[PDB]
Design a protein around this ligand. Structure first.
Ligand SMILES: CC(C)[C@H](NC(=O)C(C)(F)F)[C@H](Oc1ccc2c(cnn2-c2ccc(=O)n(C)c2)c1)c1ccccc1
Lengths: 247, 13
């Protein structure tokens, strides 16, 4: 079995938001529903990560660390892919029953939070990213940040990350290209991977502010509330090394 | 500290 075929079989199933479309829309209502959906998607992301070849061989503490750092990049990247596959238009497909269409984008403060996620689906469409490249890229996003002091199984992590970089290369070679076009493709895709750090920085700014300001009455499920409570002091103390492919 | 995440990683799927 090829490695990308093993990343393929563990793709999470499609989750529904449980969004009642008979009731009118509001930014608060959509944000609340998406936070509850995000918690369920994160629980599914943990089950997904545990099935990635090599991940369960890392120290349990490193498994927790990597999931705590990358959760938002995994969410935004999986959302970008689902949006890119469902429409050729500017729509965020959070769930089949909750798509942020052009009318929903006009809701107060909806666009400013949606725009960073729209960048992901725009880039995947502009770069015409394949299913195999996406799978390798999403696994690389789980391995895109480490603590500034490193991991307990750092040597093993460096070996695993290298293996999935090699996998991305193999997926690229399949796209009917020559050495010069494949050099351009690897560069373009690793640039999109690099840009995910800036996408996440912007989404986490909204996330952390919305979570800390209790007067907004924005509910976060236990799974997200726990990750956010862990992540805020780590960003505060500079405890993060964001891995980059380019400088 | 991160009780839920630890449980999901520790439990058998
Ligand atoms: C994760 C939350 C903390 C966020 N909320 C905030 O920060 C906010 C707005 F309260 F401040 C939330 O983020 C996402 C991100 C992805 C999401 C979801 C729900 N489902 N999906 C996915 C995931 C994988 C997948 O494959 N598909 C098809 C959909 C929620 C958010 C962000 C912007 C606007 C609303 C909600």
């Amino acid at each position: 079995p090829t490695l990308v075929s093993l990343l393929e079989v563990i793709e999470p199933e499609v989750l529904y938001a449980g969004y009642d479309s008979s009731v009118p829309d509001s930014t608060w209502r959509i944000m609340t529903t998406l936070n509850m959906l995000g918690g369920r998607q994160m629980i599914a992301a943990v089950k997904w990560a545990k099935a990635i070849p090599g991940f369960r061989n890392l120290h349990l503490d490193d498994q927790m660390t990597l999931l705590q750092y990358s959760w938002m990049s995994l969410m935004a990247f999986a959302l970008g892919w689902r949006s890119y596959r469902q429409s050729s238009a500017n729509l965020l497909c959070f769930a089949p029953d909750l798509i942020i269409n052009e009318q929903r984008m006009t809701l107060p403060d909806m666009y400013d939070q949606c725009k960073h996620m729209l960048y992901v689906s725009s880039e995947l469409h502009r770069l015409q990213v394949s299913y195999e490249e996406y799978l390798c890229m999403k696994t690389l996003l789980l391995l895109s940040s480490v603590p500034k002091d490193g991991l307990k199984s750092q040597a093993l992590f460096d070996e695993i990350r290298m293996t999935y970089i090699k996998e991305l290369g193999k997926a690229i070679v399949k796209r009917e290209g020559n050495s010069s076009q494949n050099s351009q493709r690897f560069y373009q895709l690793t640039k999109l991977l690099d840009s995910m750090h800036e996408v996440v920085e912007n989404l986490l700014n909204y996330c952390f502010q919305t979570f800390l300001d209790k007067t907004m009455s924005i509910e976060f499920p236990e799974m997200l509330a726990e990750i956010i409570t862990n992540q805020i002091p780590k960003y505060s103390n500079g405890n993060i090394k964001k891995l980059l492919f380019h400088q | 500290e991160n009780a839920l995440l630890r449980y999901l990683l520790d439990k058998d799927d």
